[PDB]
């Protein structure tokens, strides 16, 4: 390493990965609600029929 | 009452028969109560 306080930046690199994967999960579950919506609308028109 | 006229097409030897009625619908009837199966045999007109 360069620094011996780069042992502490291993821990911050670790959070960084977490923070950018939680961004990716918020946009995943909004695309999963958009799929449970078309399937809910698909079955709701049958209820009206 | 009424005793419904059918026409007996054929008998089966398990106490049943297939009637075709002149009113259309066939029926898988049972030969039960006050009947000999020796007075049955193709061409009969029956009381259902």
């Amino acid at each position: 390493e360069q620094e011996a306080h780069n042992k502490a930046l291993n821990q911050f690199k670790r959070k960084l990965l977490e923070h950018r994967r939680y961004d990716d999960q918020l946009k995943q579950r909004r695309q999963n609600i958009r799929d449970l919506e078309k399937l809910y609308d698909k079955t709701e028109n049958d209820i009206k029929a | 009452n009424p005793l419904s006229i059918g026409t007996l097409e054929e008998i089966i030897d398990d106490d049943h028969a297939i009637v075709t009625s002149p009113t259309m619908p066939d029926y898988y009837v049972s030969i039960l109560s006050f009947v000999d199966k020796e007075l049955l045999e193709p061409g009969c007109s029956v009381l259902l």
Partner: protein, 158 residues
């Protein structure tokens, strides 16, 4: 990582990276609230899917009439302010009042024709104006599609 590494010992000071990390603790706190919210919402949603589709599954099981389709003549889809039909009616402001969605006329083997509002699960791509359909015998709604009928002597050719 493109922040907080040996790339940024060169670029920035490492006490700025000490304070960066305690702001990524603040932002993943906000994001953690927001993910649990969206899980919870999908837990409400899946049981509203289950609710609708169980109904369809009673109708789906036996017995049901077997019929052909006269024609799909349709009616304009529902999204309008005055009617949503293709044939002009008396009076103004309608959309569900006597207005109806797409139309399929089906001809029975009990020998009649019924104008039913067609099932919104069965497409117009699944209806041809001769197509052999199921119809629910208790209340006439196009239940499914089935393949074209063949007489027993034609089955006996095979």
């Amino acid at each position: 990582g493109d922040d907080e590494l040996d790339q940024e010992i060169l670029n920035l000071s490492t006490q700025e990276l000490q304070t960066r990390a305690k702001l990524l603790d603040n932002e993943i706190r906000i994001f953690r609230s927001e993910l649990q919210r969206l899980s919870h919402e999908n837990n409400v949603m899946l049981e509203k899917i289950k609710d609708n589709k169980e109904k369809i599954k009673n109708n789906r099981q036996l017995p049901y009439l077997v019929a052909n389709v006269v024609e799909v003549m349709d009616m304009n889809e529902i999204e309008d302010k005055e009617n949503s039909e293709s044939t002009t009616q008396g009076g103004n402001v309608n959309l569900d009042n006597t207005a109806v969605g797409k139309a399929a006329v089906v001809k029975t083997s009990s020998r009649q024709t019924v104008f039913l509002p067609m099932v919104g699960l069965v497409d117009p791509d699944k209806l041809k104006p001769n197509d052999l359909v199921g119809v629910n015998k208790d209340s006439y709604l196009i239940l499914d599609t089935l393949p074209s009928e063949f007489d027993s002597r034609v089955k006996a050719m095979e």
